[PDB]
């Protein structure tokens, strides 16, 4: 009855320099939004202190309209996506948001200890391990320990 996330996994290897997959944010409710009001989080544990980097090679909403950051710590750590003011109508969707998370020094992740990693999902499906927040509330998904 509100926005939700679909996910698929591209890089399925435990050990990799790039976490890689796609998101799709679908507005299933009756209210149009601006994406500027929506926060997405993909939870993963960082194995290194090198700078973490987000890269989106394609999305229909334009990659320049994404505002990536990293937050939390330990088992609460995540990639966060925020957005510029891009309207997302009721019934609409972003379409694919490709994502890669890598280190500036090209260090290897261990994905096996990442809460949001699911290598068995190769086609988009509604996915509760990536969260959305809006208006200070959790509106989609379950965060770690949540
Ligand atoms: Ca990890």
Q: Under DSSP, is residue 22 helix (H, G, I), strand (E, B) or coil?
A: strand
Query: From CA 22, how far away is CA 112, in angstroms rounded?
Result: 18
Any idea where the domains of the chain sit in the sequence?
A: 1-146
Distances (CA, A) of 40 to 15, 77, 128: 24, 13, 12
Which residues, 6 or more positions from 142, have their beta carbon under 8 angstroms from its beta carbon? Answer: 128, 129, 131
* Number of Cβ atoms within 10 Å of the Cβ of 6: 19
The DSSP line for 77-110 is -EEEEEE-S-EE-TT-B---EEEEEEETT-PPEE
Ion ligand 1 residue ranges (Cβ < 5 Å): 45, 110, 113-114
What is the whole-number distance in angstroms between the Cα of residue 4 and the centre of ligand 1?
Answer: 24
Which CATH number is 1-146 given?
Answer: 2.60.40.710
Structure solved via: X-ray
2 is in an annotated binding site: no
């Amino acid at each position: 009855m509100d926005v939700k996330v679909q996910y698929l996994c591209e890089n399925t290897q435990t050990s990799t320099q790039e976490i890689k997959g796609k998101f799709n944010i679908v507005n299933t409710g009756n209210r149009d939004y601006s994406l500027k009001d929506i926060v997405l989080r993909y939870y993963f544990t960082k194995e290194h202190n090198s700078q973490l980097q987000f890269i989106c090679y394609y999305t229909p909403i334009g990659s320049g309209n994404l505002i990536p950051s990293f937050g939390g710590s330990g088992d609460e750590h995540y990639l966060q996506l925020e957005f510029k003011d891009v309207k997302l109508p009721a019934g609409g969707q972003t379409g694919e948001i490709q994502f890669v998370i890598r280190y500036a020094d090209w260090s290897f992740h261990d994905q096996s200890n990442d809460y949001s990693f699911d290598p068995t999902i190769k086609a988009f499906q509604d996915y509760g391990k990536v969260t959305l927040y809006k208006n200070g509330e959790l509106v989609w998904g379950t965060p770690p320990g949540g």
